[PDB]
């Protein structure tokens, strides 16, 4: 299975009430392993997973130092953008940054990313070739010319195809029992009587990892996409995820519906039926 490593950064300006809030988190696939909170007392990068705790002090002092530097960058960016858009110093704005790499099942570099957003909208992003940029608007183009002129893309390329993939591999290795595991979902159905001539059939998939999963309903082998109530995959709080798909079934028709669960943790897809 292919994997990925990603770092997410959120910086929020609090006009008249201190420095902006800066939150940074790192992930390997769907498992968080580090975090940083500018409002936290420690002021250090902290571990959020078992397999990273065994990194020595050098690692923690290094990432803390670099995360603090990231924080400082987003602190200056907020002001730059505030001016690029001629905005009041009273309003609260948000800048987001995301960068990382994906490797194939062969653990080799597949693609790299480095995107940036302002108040929820794309601002600038590195293109797949890792040499050109996608400037959202007019303000974004000023940054693009400056990153072009400074040869920013070239440096990110070195990081995304080198360090990023190398540490991803190291992490995948150090956390084998975790990151390289495949937790099949626990499944079941619930039957609730809507009224007299109908009932809601809900298909459950629980305690599964990674998050990716496909849960669909069928009537006589026909896809019920449009008639399926499908929720957003949520976290259990213990590293596993949960999800459900439901449909309304006319009386005496439970036999016609099948629930199909596709997940990497399954030896073969599952076909559940109320019975």
């Amino acid at each position: 299975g292919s994997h990925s490593m990603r770092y997410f950064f959120t910086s929020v300006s609090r006009p008249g009430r201190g420095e902006p809030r800066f939150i940074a988190v790192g992930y390997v696939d769907d498992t968080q392993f580090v975090r940083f909170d500018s409002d936290a007392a420690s002021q250090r990068m902290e571990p959020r997973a078992p397999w990273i705790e065994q990194e020595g002090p050098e690692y923690w002092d290094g990432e803390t130092r670099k995360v603090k530097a990231h924080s400082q960058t987003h602190r200056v960016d907020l002001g730059t953008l505030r001016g690029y858009y001629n905005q009041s110093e009273a309003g609260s704005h948000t800048v987001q940054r995301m960068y990382g790499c994906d490797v194939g099942s062969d653990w080799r570099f597949l693609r790299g990313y480095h995107q940036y957003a302002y108040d929820g909208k794309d601002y600038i992003a590195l293109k797949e070739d890792l040499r050109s940029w996608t400037a959202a608007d007019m303000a974004a183009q000023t940054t693009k010319h400056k990153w072009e002129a400074a040869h920013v893309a070239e440096q990110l390329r070195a990081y995304l195809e080198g360090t990023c993939v190398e540490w991803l591999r190291r992490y995948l290795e150090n956390g084998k029992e975790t990151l390289q595991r495949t937790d099949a979902p626990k499944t079941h159905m619930t039957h609730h009587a809507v009224s007299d001539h109908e009932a809601t059939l809900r298909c459950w998939a629980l305690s599964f990892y990674p998050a990716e999963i496909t849960l669909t309903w069928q009537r006589d082998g026909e896809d019920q996409t449009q008639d399926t109530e499908l929720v957003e995959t949520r976290p259990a709080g213990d590293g596993t995820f949960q999800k459900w798909a439901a449909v309304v079934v006319p009386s005496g028709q439970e036999q016609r519906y099948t629930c199909h669960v596709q997940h990497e943790g399954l030896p073969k897809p599952l076909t559940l039926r109320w019975e």
């Binding site: 997410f8 959120t10 939150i23 988190v25 992930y27 968080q32 975090r35 987001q96 957003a117 909208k121």
Partner: peptide
């Protein structure tokens, strides 16, 4: 959980 977001930039917290 620590503030994070999805592909479309929208936030999510537990």
């Amino acid at each position: 959980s620590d503030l994070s977001f999805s592909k479309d930039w929208s936030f999510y917290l537990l």
